[PDB]
Design a protein around this nucleic acid. Structure first.
Ligand SMILES: Nc1ccn([C@H]2C[C@H](O)[C@@H](COP(=O)(O)OP(=O)(O)OP(=O)(O)O)O2)c(=O)n1
Ligand SMILES: [Ca+2]
Ligand SMILES: [Ca+2]
Ligand SMILES: [Cl-]
Ligand SMILES: [Cl-]
Ligand code: NA
Length: 320
DNA sequence: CCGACGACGCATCAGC
DNA sequence: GCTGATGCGG
DNA sequence: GTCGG
């Protein structure tokens, strides 16, 4: 049901143009439930699955009959809408900044490059590598990036453990970018016994010229840019987005569940936890006046599934 | 009908 | 400077 | 935009 892409374009419109985040999540939920439905949908009535209601069923009926959606056709022709949608593809430009740029007449890639002085630091790096960040990463390259990260982390301190998460851990043949969960025994929910734990790793990866740029950096989260080294006379590899998350070592299982995703899977799982009277974040699962109690004991990813009475789903089956 | 929609880190800004 | 809200991101 | 109660 690849064509019924339609829902994704509608979601993107609502987020970027309408600034209607709940419509955006509604369409993405519908897109997700349809994407795992194992038959070729033949009518909106059939599609009207949890999260598909009347309005999306009507849109699906139009799309099946004609191959297009007039609502999208109008959105694709509208210059302001299409310009706002385009500017949000630069990392760091969201729907508010995109509309502000378009209001000032900044509407194309050319315009951004001419007006670089008007971008914050994140946006400037997102513009700089705009083309590269569009490309996906083949798993073969992800494997090499994994080896660099884990080996350099080991050189800093053999007690670190770095785990590559995201779509890579879900077994995807290509990834949007690299996600690294990092733990160290000196950083638990009970204490922080060593400072600079994330900084020293970031610094080492910069020192060997793997990390090339920083988008944001605090005590526990790094978001930046990296690049594989290339061989003599070879074209350079594209620059890649890299995220590193330092998680308390005793909260690894909640963190690797979060960082493995997908984002929709996490949303569904956490919503379901709420219905079961728990709340899950990347640190803890806590029972719910609806006030979170104390963290429940967790010794495995499966324990989190057990609490909310879901059967265990391996990462490869979490790609929603 | 209508409340409720996952959860949170870092950058930036207003107000102080 | 800090605090809280907002924007943007994973 | 959708849905449980
Ligand atoms: N709104 C979001 C976005 C992401 N994540 C979590 C689950 C994701 O799997 C992980 C990494 O986010 P990514 O944006 O890198 O996406 P993926 O790694 O899943 O896919 P890809 O990088 O291949 O596009 O962060 C989340 O919980 N909520
Ligand atoms: Ca991405
Ligand atoms: Ca990723
Ligand atoms: Cl269309
Ligand atoms: Cl917590
Ligand atoms: Na963006």
């Amino acid at each position: 049901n690849g064509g019924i892409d339609m829902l994704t374009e509608l979601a993107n419109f609502e987020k970027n143009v309408s600034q209607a985040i709940h419509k955006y999540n509604a369409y993405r939920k519908a897109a997700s439930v349809i994407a795992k439905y194992p038959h070729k949908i033949k009518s909106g009535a059939e599609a009207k699955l949890p999260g598909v209601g009347t309005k999306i069923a009507e849109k699906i009926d139009e799309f099946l009959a004609t191959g297009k959606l007039r609502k999208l056709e109008k959105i694709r022709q509208d210059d302001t809408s299409s310009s706002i949608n385009f500017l949000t593809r630069v990392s760091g430009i969201g729907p508010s900044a995109a509309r502000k740029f378009v209001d000032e007449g900044i509407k194309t890639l050319e315009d951004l490059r001419k007006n670089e002085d008007k971008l914050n630091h994140h946006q400037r790096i997102g513009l700089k590598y705009f083309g590269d960040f569009e490309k996906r990463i083949p798993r073969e390259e992800m494997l090499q990036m994994q080896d660099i990260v884990l080996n350099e982390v080991k050189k800093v301190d053999s007690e670190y453990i770095a785990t590559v998460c995201g779509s890579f851990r879900r077994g995807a043949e290509s990834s949007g970018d690299m996600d690294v969960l990092l733990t160290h025994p000196s950083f638990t929910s009970e204490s922080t016994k060593q400072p600079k734990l994330l900084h020293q790793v970031v610094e080492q990866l910069q020192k060997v010229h793997f990390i090339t740029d920083t988008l944001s950096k605090g005590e526990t989260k790094f978001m930046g840019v990296c690049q594989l080294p290339s061989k003599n006379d070879e074209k350079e590899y594209p620059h890649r987005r890299i995220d590193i998350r330092l998680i308390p070592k005793d909260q690894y299982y909640c963190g690797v569940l979060y960082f493995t995703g997908s984002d929709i899977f996490n949303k569904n799982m956490r919503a379901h936890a709420l219905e079961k009277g728990f709340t899950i974040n990347e640190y803890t699962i806590r029972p719910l006046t609806g006030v979170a109690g104390e963290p429940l004991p967790v010794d495995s990813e499966k324990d989190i599934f057990d609490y909310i009475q879901w059967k265990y789903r391996e990462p490869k089956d979490r790609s929603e």
